[PDB]
Amino acid sequence: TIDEGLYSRQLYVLGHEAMKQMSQSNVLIIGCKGLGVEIAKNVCLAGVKSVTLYDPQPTRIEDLSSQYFLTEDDIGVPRAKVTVSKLAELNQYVPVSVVDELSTEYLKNFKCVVVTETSLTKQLEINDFTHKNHIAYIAADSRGLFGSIFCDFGENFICTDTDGNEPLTGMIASITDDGVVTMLEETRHGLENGDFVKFTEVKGMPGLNDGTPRKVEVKGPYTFSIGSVKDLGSAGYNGVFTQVKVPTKISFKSLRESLKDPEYVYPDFGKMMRPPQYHIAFQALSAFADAHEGSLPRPRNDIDAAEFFEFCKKIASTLQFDVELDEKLIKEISYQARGDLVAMSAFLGGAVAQEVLKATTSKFYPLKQYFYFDSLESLPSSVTISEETCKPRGCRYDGQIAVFGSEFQEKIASLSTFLVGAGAIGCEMLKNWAMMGVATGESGHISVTDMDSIEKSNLNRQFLFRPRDVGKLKSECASTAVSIMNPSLTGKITSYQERVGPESEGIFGDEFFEKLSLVTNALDNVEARMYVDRRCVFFEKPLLESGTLGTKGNTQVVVPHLTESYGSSQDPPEKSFPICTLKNFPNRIEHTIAWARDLFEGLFKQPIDNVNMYLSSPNFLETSLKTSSNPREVLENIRDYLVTEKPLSFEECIMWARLQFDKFFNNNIQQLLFNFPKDSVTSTGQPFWSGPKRAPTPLSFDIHNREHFDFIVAAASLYAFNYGLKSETDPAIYERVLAGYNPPPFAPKSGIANKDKQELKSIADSLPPPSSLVGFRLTPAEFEKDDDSNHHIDFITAASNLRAMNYDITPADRFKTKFVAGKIVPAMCTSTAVVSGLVCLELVKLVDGKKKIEEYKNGFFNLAIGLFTFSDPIASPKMKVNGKEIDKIWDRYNLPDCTLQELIDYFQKEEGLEVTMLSSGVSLLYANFQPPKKLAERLPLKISELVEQITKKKLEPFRKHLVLEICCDDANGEDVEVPFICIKL
Amino acid sequence: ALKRINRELADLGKDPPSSSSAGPVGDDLFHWQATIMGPADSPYAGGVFFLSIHFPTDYPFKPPKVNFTTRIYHPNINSNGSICLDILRDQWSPALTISKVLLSISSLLTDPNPDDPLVPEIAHVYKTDRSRYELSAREWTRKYAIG
Amino acid sequence: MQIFVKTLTGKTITLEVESSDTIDNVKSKIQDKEGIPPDQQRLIFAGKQLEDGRTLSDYNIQKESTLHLVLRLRGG
Amino acid sequence: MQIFVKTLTGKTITLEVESSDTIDNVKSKIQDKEGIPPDQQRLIFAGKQLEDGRTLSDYNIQKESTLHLVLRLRG
Numbered sequence A: 001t002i003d004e005g006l007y008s009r010q011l012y013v014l015g016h017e018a019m020k021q022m023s024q025s026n027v028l029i030i031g032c033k034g035l036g037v038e039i040a041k042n043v044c045l046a047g048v049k050s051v052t053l054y055d056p057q058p059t060r061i062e063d064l065s066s067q068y069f070l071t072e073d074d075i076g077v078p079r080a081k082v083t084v085s086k087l088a089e090l091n092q093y094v095p096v097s098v099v100d101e102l103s104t105e106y107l108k109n110f111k112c113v114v115v116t117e118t119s120l121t122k123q124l125e126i127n128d129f130t131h132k133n134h135i136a137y138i139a140a141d142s143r144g145l146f147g148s149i150f151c152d153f154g155e156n157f158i159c160t161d162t163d164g165n166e167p168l169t170g171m172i173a174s175i176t177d178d179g180v181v182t183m184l185e186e187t188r189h190g191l192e193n194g195d196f197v198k199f200t201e202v203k204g205m206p207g208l209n210d211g212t213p214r215k216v217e218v219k220g221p222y223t224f225s226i227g228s229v230k231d232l233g234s235a236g237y238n239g240v241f242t243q244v245k246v247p248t249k250i251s252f253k254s255l256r257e258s259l260k261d262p263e264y265v266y267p268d269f270g271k272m273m274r275p276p277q278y279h280i281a282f283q284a285l286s287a288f289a290d291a292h293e294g295s296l297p298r299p300r301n302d303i304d305a306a307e308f309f310e311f312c313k314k315i316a317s318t319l320q321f322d323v324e325l326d327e328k329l330i331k332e333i334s335y336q337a338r339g340d341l342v343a344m345s346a347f348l349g350g351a352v353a354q355e356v357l358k359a360t361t362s363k364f365y366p367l368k369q370y371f372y373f374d375s376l377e378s379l380p381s382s383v384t385i386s387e388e389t390c391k392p393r394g395c396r397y398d399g400q401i402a403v404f405g406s407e408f409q410e411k412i413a414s415l416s417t418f419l420v421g422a423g424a425i426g427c428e429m430l431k432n433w434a435m436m437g438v439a440t441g442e443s444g445h446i447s448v449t450d451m452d453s454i455e456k457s458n459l460n461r462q463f464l465f466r467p468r469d470v471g472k473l474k475s476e477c478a479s480t481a482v483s484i485m486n487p488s489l490t491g492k493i494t495s496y497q498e499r500v501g502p503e504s505e506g507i508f509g510d511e512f513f514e515k516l517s518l519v520t521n522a523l524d525n526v527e528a529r530m531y532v533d534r535r536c537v538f539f540e541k542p543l544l545e546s547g548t549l550g551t552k553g554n555t556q557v558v559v560p561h562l563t564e565s566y567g568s569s570q571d572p573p574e575k576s577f578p579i580c581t582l583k584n585f586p587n588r589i590e591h592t593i594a595w596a597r598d599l600f601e602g603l604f605k606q607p608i609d610n611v612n613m614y615l616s617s618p619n620f621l622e623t624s625l626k627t628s629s630n631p632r633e634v635l636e637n638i639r640d641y642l643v644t645e646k647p648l649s650f651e652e653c654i655m656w657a658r659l660q661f662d663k664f665f666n667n668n669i670q671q672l673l674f675n676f677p678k679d680s681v682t683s684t685g686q687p688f689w690s691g692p693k694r695a696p697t698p699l700s701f702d703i704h705n706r707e708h709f710d711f712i713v714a715a716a717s718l719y720a721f722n723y724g725l726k727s728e729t730d731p732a733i734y735e736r737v738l739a740g741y742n743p744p745p746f747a748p749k750s751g752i753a754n755k756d757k758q759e760l761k762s763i764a765d766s767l768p769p770p771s772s773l774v775g776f777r778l779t780p781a782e783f784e785k786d787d788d789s790n791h792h793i794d795f796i797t798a799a800s801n802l803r804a805m806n807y808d809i810t811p812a813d814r815f816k817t818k819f820v821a822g823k824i825v826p827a828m829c830t831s832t833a834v835v836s837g838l839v840c841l842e843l844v845k846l847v848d849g850k851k852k853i854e855e856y857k858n859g860f861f862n863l864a865i866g867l868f869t870f871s872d873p874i875a876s877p878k879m880k881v882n883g884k885e886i887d888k889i890w891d892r893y894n895l896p897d898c899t900l901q902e903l904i905d906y907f908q909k910e911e912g913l914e915v916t917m918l919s920s921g922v923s924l925l926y927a928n929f930q931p932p933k934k935l936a937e938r939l940p941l942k943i944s945e946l947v948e949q950i951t952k953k954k955l956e957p958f959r960k961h962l963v964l965e966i967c968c969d970d971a972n973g974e975d976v977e978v979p980f981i982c983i984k985l
Numbered sequence B: 001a002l003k004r005i006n007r008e009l010a011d012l013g014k015d016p017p018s019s020s021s022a023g024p025v026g027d028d029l030f031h032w033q034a035t036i037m038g039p040a041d042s043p044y045a046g047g048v049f050f051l052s053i054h055f056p057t058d059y060p061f062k063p064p065k066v067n068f069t070t071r072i073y074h075p076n077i078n079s080n081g082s083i084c085l086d087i088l089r090d091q092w093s094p095a096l097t098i099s100k101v102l103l104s105i106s107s108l109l110t111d112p113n114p115d116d117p118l119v120p121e122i123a124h125v126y127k128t129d130r131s132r133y134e135l136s137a138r139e140w141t142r143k144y145a146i147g
Numbered sequence C: 001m002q003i004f005v006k007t008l009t010g011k012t013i014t015l016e017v018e019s020s021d022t023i024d025n026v027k028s029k030i031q032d033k034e035g036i037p038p039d040q041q042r043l044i045f046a047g048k049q050l051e052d053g054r055t056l057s058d059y060n061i062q063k064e065s066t067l068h069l070v071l072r073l074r075g076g
Numbered sequence D: 001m002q003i004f005v006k007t008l009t010g011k012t013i014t015l016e017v018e019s020s021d022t023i024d025n026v027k028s029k030i031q032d033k034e035g036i037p038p039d040q041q042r043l044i045f046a047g048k049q050l051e052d053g054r055t056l057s058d059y060n061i062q063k064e065s066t067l068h069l070v071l072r073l074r075g
């Protein structure tokens, strides 16, 4: 009963059982500061049964440093009361309540308990009770640039899914007498030692098809061993194996026990000696707070730091920790005790929300048990940080000032950023910028661009868009929401509706890009990432890339003249299957879905487009005869969809749908089996339809069958939409009209100077003249998700399932078909929050203008297994040109608008290089092997004139530069690699 | 991609392929018209076959689109000119030059693979009646691949 | 010497290499055991991203060391 | 005796061999002369593929016969 229209992306990640379990769990949240509100927001978007808040402390102004649901008019009101009203709107299925007083027994109603901003004594008191009653307890703390997470899910937690991956499966080639299972040719099983698998469709060893899991002993990338199958048979052939995921028992320890001998999770292996330091430091912080009536150390105060370090020493001695305390790091923790950053709050909130979901659904591997994190490299070094500059100024940015100072606050307030994309990551980034005070100064500005519009399935993971906002532009809604969050941004945000691409260079031109300070991407496709990266490289602007996929995420930073660009490295490409496999011999559901997508494209959008283009182009046939590989197909398409098969009513449309059903699911199979009978053998004597090739079977139409009827209805509706008729969904008309159809007989055919050309010409001239029809157009069917409810997903699903039944493949329902055909990217709110936090942590480094490459950190993480990694960016490669060191990425030649001959002589004279190839855009301006006459014609022309002549298109008025790629070789004949040229028009 | 394309073109220029000659069209680098001569010991002897090569924007990170232009009677080539090659769909790596593709296509012309065909009718003809296939191939190549 | 490689999906790979092996040999072994071309592999050790052309001894990678094999993602 | 082998590039290589010579020896000679590994060689004569461990006479290869050396590919 889950709302597939709202949880569409989260269902691809968790599932149906997981969400059913999730909607029955209660979560209590103690503390409603920035971290608490972030956790509550992520939980509410996740979809737990209910959330209860407890925080009776009156609101103070500094709390606005990271709490984005509080305003300056709420000072003096309890935080829970003023936060619940805003929290209730995020999701309508998740009631949010408030409790004004807590008692121990009252904790028994909640499945999970989250604790923030609480002293150690209260945590011990609560945990001593929640542990013995088997209630998950998560405690989170955020002190400046440091964060801590502690998880305790009981003594006997049961984890059903450990790594979160889909079960592995594959096709076998031979099973020997001793359990030596071999995969097919050049196929990798991918299993691991200690896994369990079950077999099906095994021939020769029927016993293995029962389904009892067996231990796997991997002996190679292609083969493995399962044990002894001597009794079960002698040898087996073909079949399919599938992995089985088994529950695991994880045993935790209570907080009181854990304090003595903690078990750490290392977010970064580059610093493995720190977590033991933070473990002492946070306990010392709690003790000091207990020693000063809950007053934390003042920012950058040295006496308090000394007292805190004495507490640290006392605690370390008390617990017999044989660790030498690093004085600098611990005193750093002391200085930033009162810090409250929104980036750390977002990061820890995402992590802790994921932990809450793990506790409620019993999936993925939880943290076991302590997770200490720090981003101390983000501390500015180019500004003055001292007690004088870090004291609170009585403003809403006190939390950030307590860590960075007033001067760095002024530096931030005068930024001019550019955010590309306003999806989920974009919304989180905008919220972080609004909280940090970006571009609130007299010279600040923010520019947001996004061409899409709000839908119903985006509300779940995008918390700035409400159901009342459906249909508006993403950028406008985001800008208004953030202005509401921070009133000082009124008028400092500009929103466009332009796709960032080659066709929008007139708006995001030199004038736009010269004033920026950095560019941040929130895209979902690689092409746009590469284009924006090229623009940033050309204009030399810092860039922040970030991406998510389910529970995995990554963030990268590109700094001019320091690191390589985004496009300097490769990524795995999308898998493309051989055309022979797709067209004739599929053995997977993806093959049939791809085939159905191709059929849809070639049956409802290709013919219509061809017809429409023929009626407009007067010379289409002239070029088509000599250009297209098969003009006969184009002519037949035009004829059939213009004159021969023009429909007028819906009954003939249904007849056409039945005809196409027979064509594509009954006749092609008969022809194929006529060419390759089921008993045919290969050239080696082996059976043909064995292994990767599955023997097909023709499908006989049956109206009563659900699948066939669904296909008929979908095809008829799509055809009517093509021809603009009044479609119907009443089964009575379908039943009435389908019963009067007698299929024309079909019998397989065995096959067996310029006559063909004359025949094609006769067919061509038989078509009506272009003047016969003027202004007549037909609508091709485009692809979407229920926005154009022409049964697109339904038609693809029906076609794929019918072809699967043709080849006895397991069909997939509409959900999986929507996932595969639509190329939907699984999305989670927690991953978005975490990546936004990491990017905002890198932003402060970028603002300070750090120059060393060891101070930046590209981040990668997977929350399903609690894995975090950070790596230094790759330095841009250097090269030697004319005996000088040249950067291969961020260096260019600046030249005037000179003649081609002048440019060649300039390169011959200054760099001592002979120009061989010179191209701009997609045109080859000059090449050494061109005929002398052409060059002599093209030498005395200026570069702009030459490009205009070659491209047959005047340069636009707004164009202010040209990018030229030049390949030249040294005098000795050795090819030399040189940077591109930037001609200034 | 322009630099890579020009490097491949120059490499072809320095060492003639003898049996092949590929070059751009007009002054466009993202569209090539290659030519192939049929093997001597094959039914396609004395024929000249034209091929169209479209380099994607992401070359060499995406395989080139190679389509036959003439009409050829072969089990692994259909009427649209599509070619059944593993190195064009999923085995493509950023280390293969167009020369390798042309050599692969010439080898394909040398010996068809009817075990995994693309045109079942011609594959069945090849497996059943070899002489008729030979005659059809000779007639097709002398009617479409000469001139 | 024996090393372990952990993917972003939790899988573990055991490799038998020497301290004088180049990074290219390690990438080739990983390709053999996983099928990932060397140009698409991102190896991380102790916060350093391994680059082609250098040796393991440069990074002080010793026996029982752990590498992380990571990759970029395209969602948004 | 003498034979000729033509590659996919149109090059012709003349070899002096004997009918009793094994296919492995021919592949070794080809590797020596051209550097082409034996695994990637596909030798065709009169529509038949030469196999290792056999002799030229098994394929009725005679004086100044012509063979074709192509690449391996399946799919």
Ligand SMILES: *P(=O)(O)OC[C@H]1O[C@@H](n2cnc3c(N)ncnc32)[C@H](O)[C@@H]1O
Pocket (backbone or CB within 6 Å): A420, A421, A422, A423, A424, A449, A450, A451, A452, A474, A498, A499, A500, A501, A522, A523, A524, A525, A528, C075, C076
């Ligand atoms: P997620 O995929 O939900 O959000 C993606 C957002 O990125 C925007 N976007 C994609 N591609 C472009 C280009 N080329 N230019 C500008 N914005 C882009 C989508 O509109 C989503 O908002």
